[PDB]
Amino acid sequence: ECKTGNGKNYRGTMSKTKNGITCQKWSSTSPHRPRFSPATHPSEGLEENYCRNPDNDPQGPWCYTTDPEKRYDYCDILEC
Ligand SMILES: [Cl-]
Ligand SMILES: [Cl-]
């Protein structure tokens, strides 16, 4: 678990955002409804509640949040 680039191929194990709030399972639909999931983007690594980049976001790995008022947010992934 290290990152390189926008973290596109990142198949790491981090499950909390940069502010230490824990990620929402990408399969789950609360508190937020994900626009990306394992059923639609099977090649994207949407397993558990880990930090991915299904959309080649320039800011790197993010995940759906568990704080009902925070939709998504980035992950502090060690630099590779
Ligand atoms: Cl939502
Ligand atoms: Cl999105």
Swiss-Prot record:
This is Angiostatin. The record marks 33, 35 as: Interacts with fibrin. Residues 25-44 are annotated as: Disordered. It comes from Homo sapiens (Human). Disulfide bonds join 2-80, 23-63, 51-75. L-lysine binds at residues 35, 57, 71. Transmembrane segments: none annotated. Residues 2-80 form the Kringle domain. The chain holds residues 102 to 181 of 810 of the full protein.
